């Protein structure tokens, strides 16, 4: 159990991001597996479970 | 159990990011496995579970 | 059990990052395994679980 | 159990980072195993669990 | 059990880092094993668990 | 007299600007004179004349 | 007299700017004179004349 | 007289700027005169004339 | 008279600045005269004329 | 007269500056005269004229 009384709470917050990306050439070549690129300004909360951001895994057997 | 009374709390917070990325050429070449690139300005909270950011794993058997 | 009374708390916080990255050429070449690059300005909290940032593992058997 | 009364607490905090990285050429060549590069401005708190930042392991059997 | 009364506490904190890295050429060549490079401006707290920053291990059997 | 042959020229150019401004309160109080605020991402060329950006002058007699 | 043959020229150029400004309160109070604030990412070229950016002058008689 | 043959020229250029400014309170109080604040990422070229950036002058008689 | 043949030239260039400024309170109080503050990442070229950056003068008679 | 043949030249150049300024309180109090503060990462070239950066003068009669 969780109780908040009179309380101010911030969980998983992103307040203010300036990003510039200049690229003259970008290439992704993939065979199998996984690639994850460019995950930007991401916020999450999870309760009572696993939680993943920009996670990459090979094949599973 | 958790109790907050009259309390101000910040958990997993990112307040203010300026980013510049200049690249004349970017290449990812992948065979199998995993690649994770460029995860930027990420905030997370997890309760009662595992939590991963930019995790990369090889294959699993 | 956890109790906060009248208390101000910061856990896992990033307040203010200026980053510049200039590259004339970047290459990642991967065969199997894992590669993790560029994880920037990440904040996390985990309660009652494992927590990983930019973790990379080889294959698992 | 944990109790904070009237108390101000900072845990896992990064307040203010200026970074410049200039590279005329960067290459990662990987065969198996793991590579982790560039982990910058990261903050974490973990309660009652293991916690890793930029950890890298070879294969596991 | 832990109690803070009227107390100000800093644990795992980094307030203010200026970094410049100039490289005309960087290469990582890896076969098996693990490589960890450039872990910068990292702050962590762990309670009741092991905690590793920029840890690298060879394969495990 | 000016001549360009086969030539590529950039004069007064702004390619890429990301800006965030957060203010909880802004006030300008002015009595006479001049105030100039917030001039952002401005580009100009002038030929054979004077040119001013965000210039402010008091009264003239 | 000016001549460009086969030539690539950049004059007065700004390619890439990320800016964040956080203010909890801003006030300008002015009586007479001049105030100039926040001139950002400005590019200019002038030929055969005077040129000013963010210039401020008191009164003129 | 100016001549460029086969030539690459950069004059007055700003390629890459990441800026963060956090202020809990800013005040400018001015009586007469001049104030100039915050001029950022400015590029100028002037030919055959005077050129001023962030110049401030008291009154002129 | 100026001549460039086959030549690469950089004059007045700024390539790559990360800046953080944190202030809990800033005040400028001015009576007459001039104040100049915070001039950052400025580049200029002037030909055949005077050139000033962040210059401040008192009154002139 | 100036001549460049086959030549690479850098004049007035700044490639790569990381700056952090933390202040709990800043005040400028001015009566007459001049104040110049914080001039950072400035590059200039002047041909055939006087050139000043962050110059401050009292009143002139």
Author numbering:
A (entry chain O), B (entry chain M), C (entry chain K), D (entry chain I), E (entry chain G), F (entry chain P), ...: 36 to 96
Would you copy out the relevant sentences from the publication that reported this structure?
Amyloid fibers of the protein α‐synuclein (αSyn) constitute the major content of pathological intraneuronal inclusions, Lewy bodies, found in dopaminergic neurons in PD patient brains. Amyloids are polymers of monomeric protein units non‐covalently assembled through β‐strands arranged perpendicularly to the fibril long axis, forming a cross‐β structure. We report that αSyn amyloids display catalytic activity toward ATP hydrolysis in vitro. First, WT αSyn type 1A amyloids bind and hydrolyze ATP in a specific lysine‐rich cavity positioned between the two protofilaments.
To assure that the overall fold of the lysine‐mutated αSyn amyloids had not changed, we solved the cryo‐EM structure of the K21A αSyn amyloid in the presence of ATP to 3.13 Å resolution. The structure reveals a type‐1A fold but without the extra N‐terminal β‐strand comprising residues 16‐22. Still, we detected density for ATP, in the same cavity as found with the WT αSyn amyloids, implying that ATP binds but is not hydrolyzed. In accord, the ATP molecule is found in a different orientation in the K21A amyloid as compared to in the WT αSyn amyloid (compare Figures 2C and 5C). In the K21A amyloid, the phosphates of ATP point inward toward His50, whereas in the WT αSyn structure, the ATP phosphate tail points outward toward the new β‐strand of N‐terminal residues. Interestingly, in the ATP‐K21A structure, there is a small rearrangement (with respect to the ‘normal’ type 1A‐fold) of the N‐terminal stretch (residues 42‐38) in the direction away from the cavity/ATP site. This is the opposite direction to the ‘fold‐over’/enclosing rearrangement of the N‐terminus observed in the WT αSyn‐ATP complex. The fact that ATP binds to the K21A amyloids, despite a lack of chemical reactivity, was independently confirmed in solution using the fluorescent analog MANT‐ATP, which has an environment‐sensitive fluorophore attached to the ribose moiety. Whereas we detect over 400 µm free phosphate after 3 h of incubation with WT αSyn amyloids, the mutant amyloids showed little to no phosphate generation during this time interval. The binding mode observed from the docking of Mg2+‐ATP into the closed cavity of the WT structure and the open cavity of the K21A αSyn mutant agreed with the distinct ATP orientations observed in each cryo‐EM structure.
